[PDB]
Amino acid sequence: WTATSGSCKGRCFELQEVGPPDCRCDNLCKSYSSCCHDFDELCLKTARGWECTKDRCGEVRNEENACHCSEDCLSRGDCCTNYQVVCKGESHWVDDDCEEIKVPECPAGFVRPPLIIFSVDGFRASYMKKGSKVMPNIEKLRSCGTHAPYMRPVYPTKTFPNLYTLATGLYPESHGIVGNSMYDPVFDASFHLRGREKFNHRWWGGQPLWITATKQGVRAGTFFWSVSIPHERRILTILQWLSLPDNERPSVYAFYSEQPDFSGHKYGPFGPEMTNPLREIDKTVGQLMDGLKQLRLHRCVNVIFVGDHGMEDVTCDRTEFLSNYLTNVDDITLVPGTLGRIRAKSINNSKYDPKTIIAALTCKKPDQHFKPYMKQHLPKRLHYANNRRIEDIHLLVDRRWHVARKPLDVYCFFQGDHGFDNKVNSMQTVFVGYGPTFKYRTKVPPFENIELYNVMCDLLGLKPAPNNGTHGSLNHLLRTNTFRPTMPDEVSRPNYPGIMYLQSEFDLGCTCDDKVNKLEELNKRLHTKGSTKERHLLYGRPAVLYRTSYDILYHTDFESGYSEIFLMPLWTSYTISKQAEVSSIPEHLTNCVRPDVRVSPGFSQNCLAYKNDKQMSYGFLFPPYLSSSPEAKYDAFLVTNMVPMYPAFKRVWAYFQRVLVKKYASERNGVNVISGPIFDYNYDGLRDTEDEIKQYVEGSSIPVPTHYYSIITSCLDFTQPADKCDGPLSVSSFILPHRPDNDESCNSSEDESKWVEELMKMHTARVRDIEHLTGLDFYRKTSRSYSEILTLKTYLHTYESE
Numbered sequence: 014w015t016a017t018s019g020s021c022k023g024r025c026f027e028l029q030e031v032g033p034p035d036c037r038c039d040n041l042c043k044s045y046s047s048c049c050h051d052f053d054e055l056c057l058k059t060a061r062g063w064e065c066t067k068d069r070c071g072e073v074r075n076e077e078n079a080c081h082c083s084e085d086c087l088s089r090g091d092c093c094t095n096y097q098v099v100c101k102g103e104s105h106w107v108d109d110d111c112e113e114i115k116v117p118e119c120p121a122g123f124v125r126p127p128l129i130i131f132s133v134d135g136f137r138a139s140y141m142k143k144g145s146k147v148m149p150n151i152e153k154l155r156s157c158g159t160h161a162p163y164m165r166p167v168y169p170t171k172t173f174p175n176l177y178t179l180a181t182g183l184y185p186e187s188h189g190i191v192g193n194s195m196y197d198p199v200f201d202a203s204f205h206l207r208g209r210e211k212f213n214h215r216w217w218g219g220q221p222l223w224i225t226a227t228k229q230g231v232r233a234g235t236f237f238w239s240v241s242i243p244h245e246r247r248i249l250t251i252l253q254w255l256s257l258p259d260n261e262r263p264s265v266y267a268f269y270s271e272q273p274d275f276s277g278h279k280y281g282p283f284g285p286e287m288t289n290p291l292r293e294i295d296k297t298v299g300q301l302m303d304g305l306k307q308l309r310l311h312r313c314v315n316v317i318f319v320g321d322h323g324m325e326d327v328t329c330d331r332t333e334f335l336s337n338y339l340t341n342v343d344d345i346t347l348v349p350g351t352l353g354r355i356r357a358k359s360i361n362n363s364k365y366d367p368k369t370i371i372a373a374l375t376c377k378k379p380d381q382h383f384k385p386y387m388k389q390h391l392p393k394r395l396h397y398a399n400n401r402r403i404e405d406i407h408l409l410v411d412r413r414w415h416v417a418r419k420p421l422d423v424y425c426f427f428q429g430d431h432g433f434d435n436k437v438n439s440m441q442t443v444f445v446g447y448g449p450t451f452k453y454r455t456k457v458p459p460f461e462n463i464e465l466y467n468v469m470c471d472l473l474g475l476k477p478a479p480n481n482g483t484h485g486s487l488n489h490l491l492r493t494n495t496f497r498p499t500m501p502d503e504v505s506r507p508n509y510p511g512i513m514y515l516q517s518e519f520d521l522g523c524t525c526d527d528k529v530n531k532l533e534e535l536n537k538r539l540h541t542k543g544s545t546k547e548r549h550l551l552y553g554r555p556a557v558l559y560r561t562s563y564d565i566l567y568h569t570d571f572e573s574g575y576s577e578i579f580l581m582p583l584w585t586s587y588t589i590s591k592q593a594e595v596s597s598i599p600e601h602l603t604n605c606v607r608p609d610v611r612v613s614p615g616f617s618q619n620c621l622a623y624k625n626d627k628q629m630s631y632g633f634l635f636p637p638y639l640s641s642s643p644e645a646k647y648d649a650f651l652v653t654n655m656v657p658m659y660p661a662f663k664r665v666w667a668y669f670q671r672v673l674v675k676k677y678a679s680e681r682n683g684v685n686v687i688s689g690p691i692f693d694y695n696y697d698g699l700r701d702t703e704d705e706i707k708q709y710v711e712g713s714s715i716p717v718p719t720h721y722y723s724i725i726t727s728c729l730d731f732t733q734p735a736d737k738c739d740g741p742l743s744v745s746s747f748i749l750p751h752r753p754d755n756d757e758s759c760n761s762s763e764d765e766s767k768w769v770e771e772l773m774k775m776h777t778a779r780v781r782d783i784e785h786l787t788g789l790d791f792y793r794k795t796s797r798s799y800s801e802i803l804t805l806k807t808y809l810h811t812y813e814s815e
């Protein structure tokens with residue numbers, strides 16, 4: 014109930030929301046159907062339009078007008094944004110030369126530069142270049158401020174998940190807004206893009222920027238705008254707020270445009286009808302900047318120009334239909350479109366079996382334009398699993414396509430859509446930062462939108478709530494207010510075991526044909542005490558950030574941190590130069606596993622368990638194929654370098670180790686590799702404790718990894734070899750799912766050179782993803798600044814063209 018007979022006079026776009034049934038005058042009142050009767054009359058004025066003309070200059074204030082051209086408008090803060098241009102001979106902001114903003118130039122009484130977040134829906138990254146001739150205000154922002162070639166959204170590349178990620182610094186699985194529609198089975202309720210349930214506060218987790226600000230004494234304008242409030246009125250309202258007295262004036266604001274998304278859906282990302290929406294957004298930016306300039310705030314305010322996601326070409330005819338695959342199609346509910354989520358239509362159907370569904374959807378047509386996944390098997394880079402609102406069965410849809418349940422659901426209207434995998438080029442969006450706190454004419458590398466919350470906090474002097482950004486990885490965007498973190502302290506120090514066990518103490522069912530001089534006797538002791546470690550451990554040993562028991566093991570070709578709890582390495586580190594040679598496994602060592610006399614039988618794997626486990630085999634973290642010499646090759650067969658691997662995954666691993674590592678050393682002028690296992694049985698993106706492990710090698714305490722990682726590092730200047738690099742580093746990484754079949758790869762019956770690399774690209778990862786999953790902290794000893802290292806740890810190699 015709304016008692017809509019109260020008044021909005023003197024309350025237009027009130028910041029504090031007032032409780033029902035009292036009628037509201039805030040920028041959302043229309044969305045709750047709850048505005049006072051006189052709201053449109055008093056707060057949505059339109060008379061005489063949005064521009065001064067020559068004849069209105071110096072007019073008598075008439076309060077019916079949309080904006081004013083009278084002499085008192087600047088003091089009042091309600092001039093049309095072109096007032097000084099038309100009436101005082103001033104120039105438009107876009108026609109002024111760019112001049113470096115070295116310090117905030119703010120009116121007296123401003124305690125910090127304000128921040129305005131100018132958010133644009135569906136603004137694809139390539140619009141900055143392709144639409145540059147029709148967007149001169151945006152282009153001036155871009156070239157005079159700090160910009161990135163693109164900004165990576167979160168998955169799914171939908172509106173609310175991205176806007177709310179921007180607000181919180183959280184992945185959708187953590188903030189809770191996991192799609193543009195959702196079913197929460199605990200609440201037994203549904204969330205939709207349209208409608209009222211989305212306003213319930215229980216959907217929205219974490220702490221958004223406006224709350225972070227309020228709790229720390231920084232006032233915020235309201236970020237949300239009802240669709241009917243015209244853009245010009247949004248701008249004028251922000252300008253009015255900025256004219257408030259010091260004690261009432263907010264320090265943070267958001268503008269939102271529904272364009273160019275709204276047109277992009279109808280015409281495609283580059284349809285000829287797209288030029289006008291881009292022109293109109295540019296005009297709006299112009300209105301803000303002229304507006305700020307009249308108030309003497311154009312060298313005071315930090316402005317962020319940012320999109321939620323891009324836009325792809327998608328039409329009705331590129332729809333896949335589950336009714337072409339499933340005979341049971343009416344026993345499921347599909348969340349459809351550019352992704353798919355499946356659950357049982359009824360939870361009382363005991364016949365519904367997800368395994369049969371997955372199987373019926375797997376590699377059934379030769380060009381199938383979606384791939385089914387259990388959500389825990391999705392690429393870890395998507396961070397799209399640890400929420401009850403994400404259905405167990407997921408469909409990753411190819412770019413340019415839709416999935417639907419039946420043809421009747423689709424009957425064409427639209428030519429554009431978004432929602433796909435967040436590494437897809439067409440889904441990329443924009444970032445520009447302009448103002449005293451940003452750098453001047455600076456280009457920064459692409460970065461993820463999860464990082465911006467921290468930076469917005471830095472811009473405002475706020476302490477960010479716990480989030481998924483890596484605070485300091487974006488310090489290179491900022492002139493000042495940088496955040497200078499310290500490296501996490503190591504929690505467990507390693508043991509450095511010497512030779513402590515006799516060969517006959519081991520009864521492991523392991524066999525090796527190895528019963529085979531003082532020059533090379535002292536030479537091999539030094540290799541075991543760590544004499545080559547500077548070659549293979551380039552950036553220091555990783556730090557263990559949790560309580561555990563482990564050992565450092567040195568060898569000629571590799572160093573490892575061996576866990577006595579998980580009975581295998583947490584990490585193995587080695588360097589392969591450009592000139593290194595690949596050799597084969599000699600016949601005398603094919604099923605060789607040798608006890609490691611530094612490590613007790615009781616903290617060692619055993620071969621018998623693998624013999625008994627008919628499903629599980631084993632591989633090696635340091636590849637025997639890349640041993641430096643025949644004598645060094647025996648080290649690769651130590652039981653302490655062994656890890657459990659399904660024979661299907663061994664095809665992947667073997668191709669990586671035997672072919673790809675050498676290929677990368679050739680291309681990159683050497684590589685350093687760190688590899689190891691990951692255990693994430695509860696799909697939370699975080700390292701499992703021992704008691705979370707759901708699968709062991711039969712009859713043993715040897716835990717089975719869910720994934721295997723590798724971090725491949727070299728010199729960014731590839732004319733310098735990886736091991737003698739003076740400057741910045743280059744990295745690519747992977748987190749490969751450790752699966753007993755290759756059902757994920759439809760071409761896996763062919764040679765590994767036709768399908769393994771494609772799998773690995775799909776499972777590309779950031780170093781920081783691996784850190785969360787392992788509790789390790791890498792790159793502890795470089796000669797680089799820590800912030801530069803944090804940037805490197807957040808890099809994702811996407812394998813998309815420019």
Ligand SMILES: *[C@@H]1O[C@H](CO)[C@@H](O[C@@H]2O[C@H](CO)[C@@H](O[C@@H]3O[C@H](CO[C@H]4O[C@H](CO)[C@@H](O)[C@H](O[C@H]5O[C@H](CO)[C@@H](O)[C@H](O)[C@@H]5O[C@H]5O[C@H](CO)[C@@H](O)[C@H](O)[C@@H]5O)[C@@H]4O)[C@@H](O)[C@H](O[C@H]4O[C@H](CO)[C@@H](O)[C@H](O)[C@@H]4O[C@H]4O[C@H](CO)[C@@H](O)[C@H](O)[C@@H]4O)[C@@H]3O)[C@H](O)[C@H]2NC(C)=O)[C@H](O)[C@H]1NC(C)=O
Nearest residue numbers: 186187188189217218219399400401479480481697698785
């Ligand atoms: C990305 O960054 C984020 C933010 O840092 C990381 O997420 C954090 O991860 C922490 C580690 O998992 C997690 O810590 C837990 O918090 C529990 C209290 O949580 C409530 O309070 C906080 C603070 O206000 C709030 O943030 C939480 O909000 C979540 O839940 C609400 C719904 O209630 C959602 O609206 C919101 O979206 C959010 O959901 C997300 O997180 C939850 C988990 O908290 C997921 O289940 C959701 O799917 C979704 O992802 C909460 O309102 C606290 O109770 C936990 O403590 C248990 O475990 C510890 C182990 O140390 C144990 O010692 C404790 O005693 C306790 O155990 C008991 O409970 C167990 C579980 O019921 C039980 O099994 C045992 O037997 C014990 O009796 C724990 O400290 C923190 O909440 C979230 N925060 C957020 C915002 O998500 C995230 O990890 C990062 N991601 C990556 C990849 O790095």
Ligand SMILES: CC(C)c1cc(CNc2ncc(C(=O)N3CCC34CN(S(C)(=O)=O)C4)cn2)cc(OC(F)(F)F)c1
Nearest residue numbers: 132172176177179180206207236237238240267268269
């Ligand atoms: C960049 C960050 C800081 C941010 C900006 C804004 C900006 N303001 C805003 N205002 C209204 C809408 C809106 O209405 N949008 C989107 C789809 C729909 C909903 N429908 S509709 C009106 O048809 O129901 C269009 C969207 N953005 C909001 C925001 O909060 C949030 F994440 F929760 F969104 C965060």
Ligand SMILES: [Ca+2]
Nearest residue numbers: 134135172321
């Ligand atoms: Ca959008």
Ligand SMILES: [Ca+2]
Nearest residue numbers: 693699700701
């Ligand atoms: Ca986990």
Ligand SMILES: [Cl-]
Nearest residue numbers: 192193194348
């Ligand atoms: Cl969705």
Ligand SMILES: [K+]
Nearest residue numbers: 623626629630
């Ligand atoms: K076996």
Ligand code: NA
Nearest residue numbers: 755756758761
């Ligand atoms: Na296959």
Ligand SMILES: [Zn+2]
Nearest residue numbers: 135274278431
């Ligand atoms: Zn859209």
